[PDB]
Structure formats: structure tokens, C-alpha cells
Amino acid sequence: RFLKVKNWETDVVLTDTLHLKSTLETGCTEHICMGSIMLPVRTKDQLFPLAKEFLDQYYSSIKRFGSKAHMDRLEEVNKEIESTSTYQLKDTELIYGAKHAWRNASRCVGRIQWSKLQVFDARDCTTAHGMFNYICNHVKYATNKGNLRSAITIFPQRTDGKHDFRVWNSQLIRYAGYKQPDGSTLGDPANVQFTEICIQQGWKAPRGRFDVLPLLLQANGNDPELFQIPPELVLEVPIRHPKFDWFKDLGLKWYGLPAVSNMLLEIGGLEFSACPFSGWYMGTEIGVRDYCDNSRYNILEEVAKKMDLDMRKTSSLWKDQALVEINIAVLYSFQSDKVTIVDHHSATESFIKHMENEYRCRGGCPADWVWIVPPMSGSITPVFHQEMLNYRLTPSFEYQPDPWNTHVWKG
Amino acid sequence: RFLKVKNWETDVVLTDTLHLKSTLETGCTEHICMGSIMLPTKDQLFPLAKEFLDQYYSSIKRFGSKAHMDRLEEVNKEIESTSTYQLKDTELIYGAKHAWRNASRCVGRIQWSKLQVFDARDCTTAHGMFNYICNHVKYATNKGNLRSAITIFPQRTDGKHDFRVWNSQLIRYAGYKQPDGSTLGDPANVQFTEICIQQGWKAPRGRFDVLPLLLQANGNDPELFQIPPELVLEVPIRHPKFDWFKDLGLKWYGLPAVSNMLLEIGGLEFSACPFSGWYMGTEIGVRDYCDNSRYNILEEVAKKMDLDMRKTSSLWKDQALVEINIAVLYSFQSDKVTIVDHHSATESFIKHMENEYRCRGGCPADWVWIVPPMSGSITPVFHQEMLNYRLTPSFEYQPDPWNTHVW
Ligand code: HEM
Ligand code: HEM
Ligand SMILES: CNCCN(C)c1cncc(CCc2cc(C)cc(N)n2)c1
Ligand SMILES: CNCCN(C)c1cncc(CCc2cc(C)cc(N)n2)c1
Ligand SMILES: C[C@H](O)[C@H](O)[C@H]1CNc2nc(N)[nH]c(=O)c2N1
Ligand SMILES: C[C@H](O)[C@H](O)[C@H]1CNc2nc(N)[nH]c(=O)c2N1
Ligand SMILES: [Zn+2]
Numbered sequence: 159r160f161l162k163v164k165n166w167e168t169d170v171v172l173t174d175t176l177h178l179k180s181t182l183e184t185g186c187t188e189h190i191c192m193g194s195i196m197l198p199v200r201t202k203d204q205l206f207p208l209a210k211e212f213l214d215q216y217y218s219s220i221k222r223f224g225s226k227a228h229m230d231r232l233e234e235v236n237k238e239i240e241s242t243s244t245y246q247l248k249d250t251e252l253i254y255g256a257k258h259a260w261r262n263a264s265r266c267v268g269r270i271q272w273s274k275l276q277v278f279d280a281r282d283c284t285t286a287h288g289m290f291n292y293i294c295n296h297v298k299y300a301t302n303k304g305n306l307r308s309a310i311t312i313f314p315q316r317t318d319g320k321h322d323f324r325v326w327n328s329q330l331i332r333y334a335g336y337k338q339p340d341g342s343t344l345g346d347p348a349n350v351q352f353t354e355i356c357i358q359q360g361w362k363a364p365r366g367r368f369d370v371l372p373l374l375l376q377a378n379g380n381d382p383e384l385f386q387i388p389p390e391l392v393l394e395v396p397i398r399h400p401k402f403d404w405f406k407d408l409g410l411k412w413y414g415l416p417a418v419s420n421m422l423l424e425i426g427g428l429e430f431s432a433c434p435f436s437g438w439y440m441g442t443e444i445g446v447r448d449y450c451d452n453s454r455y456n457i458l459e460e461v462a463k464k465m466d467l468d469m470r471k472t473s474s475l476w477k478d479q480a481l482v483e484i485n486i487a488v489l490y491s492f493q494s495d496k497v498t499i500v501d502h503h504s505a506t507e508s509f510i511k512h513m514e515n516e517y518r519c520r521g522g523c524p525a526d527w528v529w530i531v532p533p534m535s536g537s538i539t540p541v542f543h544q545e546m547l548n549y550r551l552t553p554s555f556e557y558q559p560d561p562w563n564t565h566v567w568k569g
Numbered sequence: 570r571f572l573k574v575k576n577w578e579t580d581v582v583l584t585d586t587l588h589l590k591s592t593l594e595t596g597c598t599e600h601i602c603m604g605s606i607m608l609p610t611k612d613q614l615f616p617l618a619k620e621f622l623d624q625y626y627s628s629i630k631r632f633g634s635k636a637h638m639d640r641l642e643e644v645n646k647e648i649e650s651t652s653t654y655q656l657k658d659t660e661l662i663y664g665a666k667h668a669w670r671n672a673s674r675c676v677g678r679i680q681w682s683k684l685q686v687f688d689a690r691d692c693t694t695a696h697g698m699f700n701y702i703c704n705h706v707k708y709a710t711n712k713g714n715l716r717s718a719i720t721i722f723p724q725r726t727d728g729k730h731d732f733r734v735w736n737s738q739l740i741r742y743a744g745y746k747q748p749d750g751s752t753l754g755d756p757a758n759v760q761f762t763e764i765c766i767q768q769g770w771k772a773p774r775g776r777f778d779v780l781p782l783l784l785q786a787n788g789n790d791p792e793l794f795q796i797p798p799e800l801v802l803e804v805p806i807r808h809p810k811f812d813w814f815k816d817l818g819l820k821w822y823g824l825p826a827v828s829n830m831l832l833e834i835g836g837l838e839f840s841a842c843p844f845s846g847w848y849m850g851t852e853i854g855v856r857d858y859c860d861n862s863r864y865n866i867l868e869e870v871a872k873k874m875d876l877d878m879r880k881t882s883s884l885w886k887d888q889a890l891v892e893i894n895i896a897v898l899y900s901f902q903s904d905k906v907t908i909v910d911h912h913s914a915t916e917s918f919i920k921h922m923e924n925e926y927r928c929r930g931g932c933p934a935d936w937v938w939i940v941p942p943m944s945g946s947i948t949p950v951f952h953q954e955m956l957n958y959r960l961t962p963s964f965e966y967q968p969d970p971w972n973t974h975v976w
Binding site: 161163164166167177180183184185186187188189190191192193194195196441446447450451452453458472473474475477478479481482485486489493501503504507526527528531532533534535536537538542543544545546547548549 | 572574575577578588591594595596597598599600601602603604605606607850855856859860861862867881882883884886887888890891894895898902910912913935936937940941942943944945946947951952953954955956957958
């Protein structure tokens with residue numbers, strides 16, 4: 159079966175075959191499209207075909223499909239599953255596996271980078287204190303004094319589901335939020351619940367607008383423990399604007415390192431429930447989403463005020479004007495301080511070249527248009543006009559439940 | 570079976586039941602989502618009519634009444650003999666409004682019940698079609714106070730006597746390839762203009778030449794008519810601060826009118842059903858003016874504003890975009906031509922959604938089309954989960970007639 163996608167700006171048409179290897183479910187049916195929906199303990203029986211699918215893919219990628227080494231490896235894994243209910247990945251397989259989960263991550267606009275990923279193997283870790291040290295090391299390697307390097311740290315896989323490793327933070331670096339008695343929020347409103355958990359557990363909150371949260375780390379299904387990332391490892395950028403000198407007096411800054419810590423990495427049927435990964439920011443993530451979402455720092459009004467835009471009617475497009483100035487400021491600031499950042503034009507241009515390449519060498523590139531198109535200036539980026547196919551390839555990153563909802567407290 | 574949609578800005582969660590009446594297909598499956606793809610008998614007709622009449626009699630609180638049963642009987646009788654049926658005026662009007670109500674790609678559906686329906690089912694020739702359409706254009710234009718309207722020509726019969734308006738919209742600008750290598754006018758319309766010239770049109774060869782109408786009546790070869798110039802309201806584009814903006818010499822038409830869709834009601838197919846509303850500002854300012862395949866004006870504007878165009882990260886494209894959009898809205902508003910900005914329309918749509926969840930049990934919506942083409946996440950629609958599904962009565966894409974027509 160062949161599927162075509164067209165670009166409506168260039169009329170270029172691509173043909174997808176890779177979707178034939180798709181496995182998990184989309185949420186959609188012939189009667190309903192769920193394309194804008196944010197969120198839609200294996201038996202041995204289910205595991206060996208998953209392991210086999212993975213190993214065939216890995217051995218083909220190294221041009222050793224059907225070799226003695228491939229066959230011996232299938233037999234070795236088969237015997238390990240029947241006798242222990244699970245198996246262990248070789249380091250090479252873990253590396254291939256993590257890079258491909260990135261390659262396959264349909265909501266990721268950054269994928270032109272996928273083969274340049276530093277994989278830190280933390281499967282010998284046994285305590286939360288051990289997790290902290292691996293994470294500190296990840297953060298310092300990835301930050302690299304502003305010359306950011308993509309990386310992932312991989313903690314031990316799930317066993318019976320009662321011994322999970324998990325990073326309770328959604329991202330390694332985030333600012334606290336504090337709900338005041340009058341209903342106003344201090345800091346980042348989206349992190350109030352999690353800030354409360356950290357406080358309950360003993361965090362002494364500075365209670366300012368940009369307090370870096372502590373890590374809360376669970377090893378081997380034990381209760382999580384709190385650690386402060388050393389301030390000196392947390393690189394931050396004060397936000398200023400190249401023409402507007404009052405911009406700095408807004409008191410804004412943001413952290414350099416975007417790091418996701420709440421997703422589950424599936425490789426060959428194994429589940430890596432703690433697998434923090436980091437890259438570098440696209441400017442719109444901070445300047446549009448973190449700063450201007452009504453539920454986040456929500457600074458549009460203040461900025462428009464300072465610009466003396468006409469704010470009596472939306473049709474003056476004052477929000478749009480302020481939005482652009484904030485985003486200019488974020489890119490300017492990061493560039494000035496020599497911290498890696500990409501703009502949304504550059505990033506979406508790179509993505510389209512990446513996509514085209516994948517279609518030629520791979521037969522496809524699953525992509526989620528809803529997530530790929532940036533949240534400002536949509537149609538002046540080339541991905542807006544690009545038809546995309548969304549499907550699920552493994553290896554993959556998946557959502558999992560928040561651990562505070564499911565953890566069994568030992569006390 | 571029952572599905573939840575969440576708004577991620579407000580936490581409001583709604584429950585959709587209306588999707589269980591979804592009839593036609595999405596193009597998606599459990600293995601693949603095609604959400605971003607632009608274009609995914611007597612026996613067959615009676616169940617479609619029944620489906621429709623049931624919903625109609627339900628809507629006027631007479632379901633299972635005698636007049637309901639009697640109408641069902643009459644239409645069945647009529648299809649059994651004639652292989653088709655006629656809608657009553659009341660049914661036609663309900664049907665047209667509901668096709669708008671069900672239009673998943675339309676952000677302006679808060680207005681759905683306020684649609685003026687012009688019944689042109691008595692029309693027999695192309696000259697008649699022209700007269701009806703001029704009347705629609707004049708009515709809808711209303712000196713700049715725009716009013717929603719549809720005009721409905723005769724339904725498909727054996728499919729060899731289709732009425733069609735070959736034009737995609739009632740009002741569009743010509744495009745012309747130049748020897749110079751470039752394109753004059755609207756580059757999207759080069760092929761259709763050629764058809765018009767091939768059919769006799771004396772082309773002016775300017776940048777904003779309104780195309781003539783090519784009307785096919787009763788499966789006949791299409792004929793050419795020029796909309797009266799004094800009925801095609803246009804707006805010159807200027808900017809409230811940049812005095813140079815007017816020197817780009819831009820204008821656009823006030824009347825957005827789709828003319829290439831098919832209207833399906835109770836299994837009947839209306840292949841010519843031009844409809845019109847009013848513009849949302851981004852449509853012109855973002856798409857018509859700034860698409861690379863369209864008038865593609867960003868570079869010229871940027872230069873006039875003296876921005877640093879050396880690097881993408883100065884956001885010069887973004888800055889020029891916003892000003893072009895501010896100019897569109899100010900120009901329409903100063904001339905007193907109805908226009909809506911993307912903030913206002915999207916707030917309206919979210920109110921409409923809530924209304925439809927509360928009163929109908931849902932609202933089919935295509936997020937990819939609903940979220941505006943600039944400033945997405947500063948509008949409330951961006952944060953709203955939506956389910957897309959196909960209800961009837963509906964507006965559908967149909968093949969372009971130059972591909973289908975046998976001359
Ligand atoms: C190197 C530079 C990178 C850039 C510029 C980048 C860009 C992005 C952006 C802008 C998003 C959307 C974020 C949001 O709206 O919250 C995203 C999503 C994501 N990317 Fe990346 N990416 C990069 C690296 C990575 C790396 C290293 C990984 C994993 C190894 C990764 C995996 C993902 C995943 C899984 C998502 C989906 C997150 C979710 O569902 O919340 N990306 N990418
Ligand atoms: C009254 C003001 C109206 C507003 C502000 C409005 C707004 C919009 C907008 C912005 C689009 C997107 C167009 C594009 O990107 O090409 C759209 C699409 C559409 N609207 Fe409306 N609408 C209006 C009236 C109507 C009316 C009167 C009807 C039918 C009687 C209608 C049916 C549709 C349909 C079927 C589409 C999809 C067309 C396609 O696939 O190209 N709308 N609406
Ligand atoms: C729920 N999703 C939004 C999460 N969010 C507010 C957030 C906070 N802090 C950091 C990120 C990073 C998301 C991300 C991850 C990666 C690997 C790269 C990239 N450019 N951005 C996201
Ligand atoms: C080719 N895709 C459609 C965009 N396009 C080139 C176009 C040109 N001219 C007019 C329209 C009208 C779209 C429209 C229709 C209606 C009823 C209301 C509205 N606000 N916009 C569209
Ligand atoms: C590929 C993609 O579907 C295409 O560019 C769409 C995206 N969203 C859109 N949204 C609207 N309102 N109008 C459009 O023409 C498009 N084009
Ligand atoms: C409801 C909708 O799916 C939601 O607001 C999405 C839209 N697109 C997105 N795109 C990105 N990149 N990140 C997001 O958080 C979202 N949120
Ligand atoms: Zn879908």
C-alpha cells in the first residue's frame with residue numbers, strides 16, 4: 159500500500175510506505191478523528207514478538223539480518239524471557255533504541271538531529287541518591303556552558319510494576335508556582351500542584367517568581383526523595399530586548415535546558431519509565447507558550463502596556479504585536495549569551511528537509527501537524543502547508559500516569 | 570462510545586455524544602491519522618431521505634406525528650416512481666442551515682441559524698444563473714453591512730445535467746504567466762483564467778482583474794458572464810501608521826463566497842450552491858497576501874519597514890506579517906465593510922462550541938482549519954480539543970468541472 163502527501167505551497171508530492179510498519183493505535187477511526195486530542199507488566203507471550211520485531215530491525219540497520227549473530231541473539235533473548243520473564247538489552251541495542259524513539263517521535267520538530275544523541279546508561283543505578291548523581295551529570299554534559307548537546311539518561315527498566323524508577327518532575331528544570339490565598343499565583347501557575355508536593359515532602363520554598371524546583375526521585379518503587387540541583391549547573395538567561403530598554407525591567411529570565419522527565423521509553427517490549435532527555439529550545443516554546451499562555455506567566459498585557467499599543471479593541475492586533483517583541487527578545491537574549499536556541503523559521507525549514515530525506519531513505523516520517531506547526535506565525539512556516547501522516551512506530555516515547563496518582567506509599 | 574474533550578487553558582471538559590450520528594468516513598483509521606490532509610440509486614436514497622426527514626421532524630417537535638409519517642410515505646412513493654424527490658421549502662432551508670452548522674472547517678458557525686436562503690431551483694439556463702448570483706452578491710454585500718447567504722440551484726438528476734459554477738469563489742482575481750518569467754496577479758488562478766480566455770474572455774492583464782463567471786446549466790457547456798463592476802465591492806488597503814503602505818497598491822474584495830462545493834441534503838445533491846459570509850482578517854492578510862504561492866508580499870513590506878532581513882531570527886517575517894494584518898482590518902473597518910479579527914472570531918467559536926455541546930451534545934470541528942494561520946496559541950481555539958466527524962446535511966468537495974465536463 160502507498161500513501162501520498164502533498165505540500166500545497168510547492169506542489170511536491172511524497173509517497174509513504176513506512177506506515178505499513180505502524181503498530182500501536184492512533185485514537186482515530188473511520189468515523190472520528192482525534193488528531194487534536196492531547197492524551198489518548200507484560201506477559202512472556204506478548205514480549206517475545208516485541209523483542210523479535212525490535213531485534214530484526216536492529217540487525218537490518220547494521221546490515222546483519224539473518225546472520226549467525228542475529229540468530230544467536232534471538233535464541234539468547236528467547237531463552238532469557240522464558241526463564242526470567244524479561245531480558246536485558248545490549249548497550250548497542252539500547253543506543254539504537256533510544257535514537258529511534260526520537261526518530262519516531264511524531265510531535266518532535268527537532269528530529270533532523272536524531273542520530274546525534276548521547277546516551278547515558280544508568281541501568282546499574284539502585285537508589286535515588288544514585289539517580290541524582292546521574293541526573294546532575296546529564297545536566298552538566300547537556301548544558302556544556304551554553305553549547306547544548308542532546309542527551310538521554312536511561313534508568314532501569316520496569317520489572318513487576320511495583321519497583322518502578324521514576325522522576326516525578328515533568329521536566330528536570332522548572333520553576334515553582336505558589337497559589338496565594340487571594341487566588342493570585344506567584345511564579346509558574348502550571349507548576350502549583352507539583353510545588354505543593356515538593357513542599358509537603360520538605361522543600362523549603364524561597365517563594366519567588368523563578369525558584370528552580372527540587373528533583374523528586376523514586377528508585378525501585380520506593381518513596382521518592384528530594385534533591386536540589388546545584389545552582390551552578392542550572393544555566394539561566396536574563397531576557398532583554400535589542401531596542402526596548404525597559405524590557406529587562408520586566409524581571410524575566412528562563413532556564414537554557416529543556417529536559418523531559420515524565421515519558422516512558424519502549425524498546426523491544428521493555429519499558430524504561432525513567433528516561434530523562436534534553437535538547438535545546440525553539441524560541442516559541444518560551445516566548446509564546448511559557449510567557450504568553452493565559453495559564454502560564456501571562457505577560458502579554460504588561461508588555462503591550464509598555465509598548466503603548468492601543469488596547470481598547472483586539473482588532474488593533476496588540477496581542478500579536480507584543481507577541482512578536484517578546485519572541486524577538488528571547489532569541490536575542492539566548493544568542494547574546496551564547497546559549498543554543500533555534501528560531502521557528504529555521505527549525506521548521508530544517509524539519510521539512512529532514513522529512514523529505516526520511517521519505518527517500520526510510521519510506522516515511524510520521525508527524526503530528528497539530529504539534530509541529532509553531533504556535534505563532536503558523537502559515538509563514540513551511541510545515542503549515544505540508545500534509546503529514548501520523549502513525550506509531552516503535553521504539554517510542556509514550557505518556558504514562560503521573561506517579562503521585564499511582565504510587566503506593568511505604569511511609 | 571461517549572467521548573470527552575478538554576480545554577487545556579481553562580480545564581473545562583465537555584462530553585460529545587453527537588459523533589454517534591457520524592455517517593460518512595474521516596479518512597483516518599486506527600493505524601493512521603489523516604487529520605492534516607486537505608482532500609481525503611433508489612435503494613441508496615430512501616434511507617438518506619428517512620434519516621433527514623426524521624431529523625427535520627424531530628427539530629420541529631413533531632417526530633412520530635401523522636404529518637411526519639405522511640411525508641415519509643409521500644417521499645418514498647415519489648422515489649419509487651421518479652427515482653428522486655423534491656424537498657419542501659422548509660426542508661431545503663433547514664437543510665442548508667444544518668450543512669453550515671455541520672461544517673467542521675468553519676470557525677464562523679455561531680451565525681449558522683442566520684442564513685438567508687435563496688431558492689433557485691426554478692432556474693433553467695445560464696443567463697438565469699447569472700441573474701440569481703448577481704442578486705445574491707448584491708444582497709449579501711448590502712453596501713458593506715454583509716449578510717450570510719446561499720443560493721441553491723437545481724439538484725443533480727442522472728448526473729449528466731449538472732448545474733455548476735466553474736469558478737471556485739464568486740469573486741477572485743485573474744492570474745497570468747508573464748514572458749518576463751514571473752506571474753502577474755493571483756498565481757493560484759492561472760489555470761482557471763486560461764480557461765476563461767480559451768472560452769472567450771477578453772482579459773485586461775492587470776493585477777486585480779475580477780474573473781468572469783463560468784456557468785454551466787443543465788449539463789450544458791458553460792457560458793461566460795461578467796459580474797456587474799458596481800456590484801463587486803472592493804477595499805483599497807492602507808495602514809493607520811505607515812503612509813507608504815497605500816503605495817504597494819493593494820486591494821481585496823469584500824465578499825467571501827465559495828462556489829465549488831456540493832450541498833447534500835437527504836441524499837439529494839446540490840452541485841451549484843454558492844454561499845457567502847464575511848471575512849476573518851487573516852484570510853486576506855496572512856494567506857492571500859503572504860502565501861508564497863499567492864501575492865507573496867512579505868519581502869516588499871519588510872523592506873519598506875527597514876527591518877534586518879539578514880537573519881530569520883530577527884523575526885522580520887513575523888513583524889511584517891502583523892502589520893499587513895493590521896492594515897487589512899483597518900482598511901475594511903474604515904470603509905465600513907464587515908470584517909472579523911481572529912481573536913473575536915475564535916472567542917465566538919468557543920462560545921458556539923459550548924452552546925452546541927449543551928444543546929446538541931457536540932460540535933464537529935477540524936482543529937487544523939479552525940486555529941488561525943497566525944498567532945495560534947494566543948487564541949482560545951488552540952487550547953481546545955476538538956473531535957472531527959462528518960454529519961449530514963453537509964458541504965462536500967467535488968471534482969473540478971473542467972476535468973469532468975464532456976464538451
Ligand atoms: C535538539 C533540539 C530539539 C528541539 C529543537 C526539539 C523541538 C521540539 C519541540 C519544540 C517540541 C514540542 C514541545 C512542547 O510543545 O512542549 C518537541 C517535542 C518532543 N521532542 Fe523534541 N526537540 C529536540 C530534541 C529532542 C530530543 C533529544 C528528544 C528525545 C531524545 C526529543 C523528543 C521529543 C518528544 C518525545 C517530544 C514530545 C513531547 C510531548 O509529547 O510532550 N526531542 N521537540
Ligand atoms: C458569516 C461569517 C463567516 C465566517 C467569519 C466564516 C469563517 C470561516 C473561515 C475563516 C473559513 C476558512 C476558509 C479558508 O481558509 O479557506 C471557513 C470555511 C468554511 N465555512 Fe465559513 N464562515 C462564515 C460563513 C459561512 C457560511 C455562510 C457558510 C455556509 C453557508 C460557511 C461554510 C464554510 C465551509 C463549508 C468552509 C470550508 C470550506 C473549505 O473546505 O474550503 N461559512 N469559514
Ligand atoms: C506539557 N507540555 C509543555 C511542557 N513545558 C511547559 C515544558 C517545560 N520545560 C521544558 C519543556 C521542554 C519541551 C522540550 C523538550 C525537548 C527535549 C526539547 C525541546 N526543545 N523542548 C517543556
Ligand atoms: C483555495 N482555498 C480557499 C482559499 N481561497 C483561495 C479563497 C478565495 N476567496 C474567497 C475564499 C472564501 C473562504 C470563506 C468563505 C466563507 C463563506 C466565509 C469566509 N470568511 N471565508 C477563499
Ligand atoms: C496541509 C494543511 O492541511 C493545509 O496547509 C491547511 C492547514 N490549515 C488550514 N486552515 C485553513 N483555515 N485554511 C487552509 O487552507 C488550511 N490549509
Ligand atoms: C488541544 C491541542 O491539541 C493542544 O492545545 C495542543 C496543540 N498543539 C500543541 N503543540 C505543541 N508543540 N505543544 C503543545 O502543547 C500543543 N498543545
Ligand atoms: Zn485522525
